[PDB]
């Protein structure tokens, strides 16, 4: 119906995903994903059943959190689609196999499941199981990517069960790189070394760029997938707000546990002291920003709409924040 | 029942582990444990409950498996006595406070904690649920320290219950560098930036080290846990051949189970093709003599007994190479 005519923006930066999870019955991620997998003839490719693959996704979406304000399955859907953008930018065309294309994809769809709702830090801070269990280290991503995997054992869930040995090791190396990147505190390494890899990058005739090891592919698709999780301030206001909306509410629950702890409240957790607007300038000027102008720098001029859209949405937020002339 | 005489070795290289072990009623761990907190004074330190140090040494000790031949309670109580007395070299005196030498001596008794007598490859090869659980990296390394802190919380196990918040903080952090410092796989790269370390060491005059921060200290606590893990072939030479034989019955069980599965057997786990003899030179001259000989570089020259030993230990086994 009319899902389908939002389901035709699937290649489009700023698809309603919203909407479609009201549509699709809160069913973003598999639709989503499933559609997406059409239109890269995944399942063609990879000799993946149908029946598999939506058994799997729909298991997968089930293990995110419907009480999660923002780490859940529409945020999961939205990494997914935006990643699947960013796979085509003209820079990078037929750069990637079609394994590392599904390697991104995958790992954009499970990179959050079963998130909590709270913080590497508070996990660490609160002495929790799954702080003991992994170390204090990348804490929330390795079980993300622990139970990922651990449902492709399900019944009727292996849906890399045509891939070849070889290819399944390889594709679970990539993923695993792939979502530990997404750790926030790996985040100044990651791009101290992606603004290096672009002084020195070397691209085709056509000016397609050109990535001859595994370590240099890895680190692009590492940050591609970063900033497609970084991505909600680069898209429309009205997609926008509501991201601000979500991660807000699960900040100031967090900030809630703290207070009731009699812990030291988080940044940007305490309901009573936070501005939405300073915050997410912060957000934007000292995180966002420093990595999507990295990024437009990689693959220019791909992403200079995507750059324009960051710097109206930074310039829209701070318009209300009184300010020095 | 006395041991005792075989305890006075504690301070020494080449104790007679195996002899406390039997002596002990297989307790090597506890017991070891327990005589170096007390000569560390580190009970009255941090005010250790003895019955609570006891509980918790005995129920890590049970997390040992008793039918692994070589990662078992008594390579942890040797690891232990290892780092205890490296700890203790002149080139090191009052360099360590007291949190730093619980730090080490704690990681080195949970380092191999309920290690099931097969690498991280076979772990990773099988698609365990161990792998599974750490995504391929570290996955023994990381499973100890789960389990040696996991059990801190057993009951009247806590021996950690009064330091401060900022302590078990700091002790936690340092036993987690520590023990995943011990992953083989990172022992290239850890051997690379000691090398670098020891290039540019200062020391003062009557030769103590100078550590400047906790980049140094943990740095030297790192490679001084996986010296003592890789001391085997610097012991005494009858320590050292019990080892020897100890870790083959587990890697060639290692290799049966590989065999058995139609697995591409690991290295050195085949019984059917095996050259111990020559496998124990190799380890030698491309693995533990090039770190020994590092190490020894970092305290000179406290470690040139340990060194010689080395080199005495390469000859036996060179000579019985059929
Ligand atoms: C560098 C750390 C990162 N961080 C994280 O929890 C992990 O990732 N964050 C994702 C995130 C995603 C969307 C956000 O808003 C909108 F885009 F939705 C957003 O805005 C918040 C809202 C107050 C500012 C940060 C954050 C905490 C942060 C304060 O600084
Ligand atoms: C299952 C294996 C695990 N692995 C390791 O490196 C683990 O670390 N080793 C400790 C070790 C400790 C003591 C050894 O001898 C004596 F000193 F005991 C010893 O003898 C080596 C080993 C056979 C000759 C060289 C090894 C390597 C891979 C093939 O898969
Ligand atoms: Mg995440
Ligand atoms: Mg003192
Ligand atoms: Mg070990
Ligand atoms: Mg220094
Ligand atoms: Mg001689
Ligand atoms: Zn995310
Ligand atoms: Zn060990």
């Not at 923006?9 to 997998?37: C, Q, Y």
């Not at 003839?41 to 149908?50: A, G, Q, R, S, Y």
């Not at 940044?267 to 420093?290: L, R, T, W």
């Not at 709409?305 to 002339?325: G, M, V």
């Amino acid at each position: 119906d009319v899902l389908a005519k939002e389901l035709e923006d699937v290649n489009k930066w700023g698809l309603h995903v919203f909407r479609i999870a009201e549509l699709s019955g809160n069913r973003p991620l598999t639709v989503i994903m499933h559609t997406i997998f059409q239109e890269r003839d995944l399942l063609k490719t990879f000799k993946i059943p149908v029946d598999t693959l939506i058994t799997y996704l729909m298991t997968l979406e089930d293990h995110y959190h419907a009480d999660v304000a923002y780490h859940n399955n529409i945020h999961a859907a939205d990494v997914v689609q935006s990643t699947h953008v960013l796979l085509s930018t003209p820079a990078l065309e037929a750069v990637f196999t079609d394994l590392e294309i599904l390697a991104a994809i995958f790992a954009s769809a499970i990179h959050d499941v079963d998130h909590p709702g709270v913080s590497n830090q508070f996990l660490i801070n609160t002495n929790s199981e799954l702080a003991l269990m992994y170390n204090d280290s990348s804490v929330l991503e390795n079980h993300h990517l622990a139970v990922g995997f651990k449902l492709l054992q399900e019944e009727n869930c292996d849906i890399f069960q045509n891939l070849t040995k070889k290819q399944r090791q390889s594709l679970r190396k990539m993923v695993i790189d792939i979502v530990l990147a997404t750790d926030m505190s790996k985040h100044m390494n990651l791009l101290a070394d992606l603004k290096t890899m672009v002084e020195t990058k070397k691209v085709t005739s056509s000016g397609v760029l050109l990535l001859d090891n595994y370590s240099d592919r890895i680190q692009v698709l590492q940050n591609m997938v970063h900033c497609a999780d970084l991505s909600n301030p680069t898209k429309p206001l009205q997609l926008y707000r509501q991201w601000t909306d979500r991660i807000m509410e699960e900040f100031f629950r967090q900030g809630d546990r703290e207070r009731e702890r009699g812990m030291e409240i988080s940044p940007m957790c305490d309901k009573h002291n936070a501005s939405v607007e300073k915050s997410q300038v912060g957000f934007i000027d000292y995180i966002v920003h420093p990595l999507w102008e990295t990024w437009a720098d990689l693959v220019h001029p791909d992403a200079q709409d995507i750059l324009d859209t960051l710097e109206d949405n930074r310039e829209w937020y701070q318009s209300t924040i009184p300010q020095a002339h």
